[PDB]
A = this chain, B = another copy of it.
Amino acid sequence: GLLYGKRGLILGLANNRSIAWGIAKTASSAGAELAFTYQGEAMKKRVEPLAEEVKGFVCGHCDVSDSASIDAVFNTIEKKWGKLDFLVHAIGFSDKEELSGRYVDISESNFMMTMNISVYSLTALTKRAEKLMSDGGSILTLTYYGAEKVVPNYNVMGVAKAALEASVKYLAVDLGPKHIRVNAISAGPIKTFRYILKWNEYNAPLRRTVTIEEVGDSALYLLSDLSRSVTGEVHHVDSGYNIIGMKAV
């Protein structure tokens, strides 16, 4: 019952294999009533049954690059609930092709789109969410170790996640006095790139990669009152990978 009576919005549920789904499954089981967005009709058809499974509801189309799209979603939530207890931001994009390259070869267009969709979107969603969380709440986003250290084939996404993590802290200072907490989970890679997985599997302290159910439980903590004195935190849920400085010999 850690989220009994709580109402939350999850952005980014695209399928039943994602972190967002892990979070939705755990939050729902913990008592949360959940609202879900989608982008495009194809995704809507995928999300509807997932929402039903969790006794949640689909609150509308959201393109985070479209300001009016975001306003419509929050207007719908305001009408249905009047208040919001938490928000999960599991959204990020970067050009698949340019990930394999050298960071220095990225295009301006990919850089800008990555920053907008993967970083600015959290700030945009939070600006609209603030009015609905007058009582307090919890905002969670997702990040990755590539923000801190150079990881192959993460390139601009690493730069973006570094920006995101810094924004989590600035947001935490802005919203702290209203008791809205803002935190990130730094998730290890998830068996759902084969190089990054295997590397984690053999070198992470726990000798396995993490699952969406595990990231889900860590999200539950950060979303619930158990974490009511935690804000501005980048929380590693990665089998301890982030602490190693070199392979064992």
Interface assignment of A146: CB less than 8 Å from any CB of chain B = yes
Check if A103 sits within 8 Å of B229, measured CB to CB.
no
Whether A123 contacts B106 by the Cβ 8 Å rule is yes
Over the window 155-176 of chain A, the binary record of Cβ atoms lying under 8 Å from chain B Cβ atoms (1 yes, 0 no) is 1001111110111011111111
Q: Is the CB of B104 within 8 A of A245?
A: no
Task: Check if A233 is an interface residue, CB within 8 A of chain B.
Answer: yes
Chain A contact-residue range equals 35 or more
Is there an interface contact between B103 and A167, defined as CB atoms closer than 8 Å?
A: yes
Which of B167, B226, B235 is in CB contact (< 8 Å) with A233? B235
Whether A205 contacts B232 by the Cβ 8 Å rule is yes
Nearest B residue (CB) for A152: B249
- List CB contacts (< 8 Å) of A80-111 with chain B: 102-106, 108, 111
Tell yes or no: A4 within 8 A of B by CB: no
Q: Is the CB of B159 within 8 A of A173?
A: no
Chain B residue at smallest Cβ distance from A121 = B108
- Interface flags, A230-249, vs B, CB<8A=1, else 0: 11110111111011111111
> How far is it, in angstroms, between the C-alpha of A124 and the C-alpha of B65 when the chains are bound?
24
Contact at B206–A217, with CB atoms within 8 Å? no
What separation, in Å, do the CA atoms of A123 and B106 have in the docked complex? Answer: 8
A228 at the interface (CB under 8 A from B): yes
Contact B226 A217 (CB under 8 A): yes
Complex interface: stretch among A34-42, A46-54, A207-215: A207-215
Please give me the residue from chain B that is nearest to A217 by CB atom.
Answer: B226
A247 contacts B199, CB within 8 Å?
A: yes
A204: chain B residues within 8 A (beta carbon): 176
Known: A153-B249, A172-B205, A235-B233. A112 touches B111 (CB 8 A): no
Q: Does A32 contact B (CB under 8 A)?
A: no
CA distance A104 to B245 in the complex (A): 18
A15, CB-defined interface residue at 8 Å: no
Quick check: A173 and B124 within 8 Å, CB to CB? no
Q: Mark A residues whose CB is within 8 Å of B.
A: 67, 102-106, 108, 111-112, 115-116, 119-120, 123-124, 126-127, 130, 145-153, 155, 158-163, 165-167, 169-177, 179, 181, 188, 195-196, 199, 204-207, 210-211, 214-215, 217-218, 220-221, 225-233, 235-240, 242-249
